[PDB]
Amino acid sequence: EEAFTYLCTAPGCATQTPVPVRLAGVRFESKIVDGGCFAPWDLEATGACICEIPTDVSCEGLGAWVPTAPCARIWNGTQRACTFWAVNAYSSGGYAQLASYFNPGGSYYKQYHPTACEVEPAFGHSDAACWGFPTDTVMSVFALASYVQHPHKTVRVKFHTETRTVWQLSVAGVSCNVTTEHPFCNTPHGQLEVQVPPDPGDLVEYIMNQQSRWGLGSPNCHGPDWASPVCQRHSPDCSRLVGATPERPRLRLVDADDPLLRTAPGPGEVWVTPVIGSQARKCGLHIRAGPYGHATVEMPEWIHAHTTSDPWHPPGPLGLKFKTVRPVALPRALAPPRNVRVTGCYQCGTPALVEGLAPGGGNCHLTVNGEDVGAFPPGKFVTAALLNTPPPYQVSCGGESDRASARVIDPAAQSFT
């Protein structure tokens, strides 16, 4: 009979007439675009207030004052910046330690004491933090900052394009997976056409390491999801950085009573302030850093509030159109395709070229590692298909499979091509 009924999209939803249709589940199909690794831009800073004029401005050379683990970690960070300021130099003796060796840029000091850091005079700054010197007060300040990639904050991200909500149905015990692309089901003596809502558009898959969390959109870096790691540090191969990068941090020596401290540092700015020591010939350092994007990202907290456990789908219901019509059975070729060549990339967003020869006896319903790439009449075929699976490629027309020739690169290799 020609019939109509609405089927809800929740677990337990089922209709009984004219033929029972049960909502078995909800899943999704897509064309994956693997972006690799993403992380927030984490400005990390360290340093030391030193009551001496050190001759080796490095983590090892400053080991007696600079915290060990933060120095080593920040030194290996992205867009490293470091400055060594001479507040009060040697009045006599020493080795390239007099005030004259601290010209702007510190080239005279660097000639005898090489360093990857900037060297600057700071003679008009307060030297009060360094006390207990009977004849010659000596004081220097070291600051080190970079964008450190924290492993606990790094997320693997897969963009989902051409998203198709899969409404898994059971029509009188027979499995039927309906989408906007394939909305028809066979019923005991007719055909069921399922009216489905539109697809949800692009999805963002945040891979926690293994758990997947879901975002709906591109994402939108201009809205509430602005702090997404996707909007920040991008590493396609989870090793090398690409695209947009902040400038090297701007380090400043700021005295405790400087009016500048009444304001907050800007993004990427690092202000260091010497703290008067409780011990003779020793001092502390107070560091004020302006994080990128005006805030520090707390990854488990961001993920929990800005993502869902499952991909989003519209509320429904589904329109079940029951028809007495039966589809015209076309002859299908079951023999595997011949001389199949696959060229390009997979999970990259650029359709790969699939070419070969479809065999006789009907249309070849071509699959590339189980992925449907369309049906082709017998003879030579050429198609541009978005592939989700890596090589080797098993090609079939619905029956037996054959190994295709492939020149296909991974998403990370595509990003560097």
Numbering used by the authors: 1 to 209, 214 to 421
Authors' text:
However, all fits resulted in similar orientations with the long direction of the known E1 structure roughly perpendicular to the viral membrane. This analysis showed that along unbroken glycoprotein rows in rubella virions, the glycoprotein complexes are similarly oriented with respect to each other, such that E2 would most likely be located between adjacent E1 positions. The common antibody binding region on E1 (between residues 202 to 285) is exposed to the surrounding environment in the spike density, given the orientation of E1 as determined by the fitting results. The observed variability in the glycoprotein spikes suggest that the tips of the E1 structures are flexible, which would help E1 to avoid non-productive membrane interactions at neutral pH.
Rubella virus is an enveloped, positive-stranded RNA virus with virions ranging from 500 Å to 900 Å in diameter. The structural components of rubella virus are comprised of three proteins, glycoproteins E1 (58kDa), E2 (42–47kDa), and the capsid protein (31kDa). Instead, the structure of rubella virus, as shown here, has an irregular helical organization of its surface glycoproteins and a pseudo-tetrameric inner nucleocapsid arrangement.
